[PDB]
Amino acid sequence: PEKSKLQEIYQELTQLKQQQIYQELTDLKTAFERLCRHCPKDWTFFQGNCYFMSNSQRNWHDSVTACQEVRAQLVVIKTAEEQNFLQLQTSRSNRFSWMGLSDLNQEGTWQWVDGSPLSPSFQRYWNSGEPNNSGNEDCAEFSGSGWNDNRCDVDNYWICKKPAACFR
Numbered sequence: 001p002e003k004s005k006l007q008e009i010y011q012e013l014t015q016l017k018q019q020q021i022y023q024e025l026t027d028l029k030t031a032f033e034r035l036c037r038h039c040p041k042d043w044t045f046f047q048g049n050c051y052f053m054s055n056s057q058r059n060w061h062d063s064v065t066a067c068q069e070v071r072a073q074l075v076v077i078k079t080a081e082e083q084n085f086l087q088l089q090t091s092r093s094n095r096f097s098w099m100g101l102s103d104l105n106q107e108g109t110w111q112w113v114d115g116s117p118l119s120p121s122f123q124r125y126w127n128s129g130e131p132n133n134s135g136n137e138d139c140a141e142f143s144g145s146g147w148n149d150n151r152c153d154v155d156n157y158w159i160c161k162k163p164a165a166c167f168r
């Protein structure tokens with residue numbers, strides 16, 4: 001079967017100035033996954049991943065579960081280019097949307113739903129004066145041209161993300 005041979009490729013990979021060897025290893029792995037670009041209907045393809053801009057609103061927690069139900073994740077932003085792309089989409093659609101970011105576990109400590117912390121290089125995306133935790137806000141949303149922390153129980157459109165697949 002096809003899905004079988006694919007296994008054989010990832011299998012061999014696992015079985016494979018040192019930082020220079022791994023850097024090229026990442027290039028190779030990426031050159032292959034680059035061939036897998038199938039996205040579910042109505043989803044957007046962007047840099048190897050598929051994004052879904054919901055057509056309805058939900059609170060933050062319900063948005064998180066909505067994404068898991070389609071084998072995806074409330075969008076966790078990894079690069080500046082990704083952030084700018086999403087911000088433009090939400091900006092043009094005039095819709096406030098949730099992202100997988102919150103300081104729920106510990107006020108002030110922003111963390112993505114995949115465990116990773118908010119890097120200082122992303123602090124520039126917050127809107128002027130944010131995050132102000134006005135009335136205890138622990139969830140991030142695309143608001144205007146930047147981010148804003150809002151209440152978890154508020155309703156917003158959301159965005160989910162998952163890797164493009166090799167088979168339809």
Ligand SMILES: CC(=O)N[C@@H]1[C@@H](O[C@@H]2O[C@@H](C)[C@@H](O)[C@@H](O)[C@@H]2O)[C@H](O[C@@H]2O[C@H](CO)[C@H](O)[C@H](O)[C@H]2O)[C@@H](CO)O[C@@H]1O
Nearest residue numbers: 127129130131132133134135137143144148149150151154
């Ligand atoms: C405590 C409170 O509810 N204040 C609201 C304002 O919202 C707060 O301040 C803004 C700047 C933002 O930090 C929100 O997260 C706070 O809840 C509210 O301003 C608007 O707030 C929405 C977000 O819900 C957008 O950010 C708009 O751009 C803001 O103008 C104002 C007017 O709606 O009412 C209270 O002061």
Ligand SMILES: [Ca+2]
Nearest residue numbers: 023024027028
């Ligand atoms: Ca290379």
Ligand SMILES: [Ca+2]
Nearest residue numbers: 107136137138
């Ligand atoms: Ca809090």
Ligand SMILES: [Ca+2]
Nearest residue numbers: 103133137138
């Ligand atoms: Ca908070």
Ligand SMILES: [Ca+2]
Nearest residue numbers: 132133134149
């Ligand atoms: Ca706020």
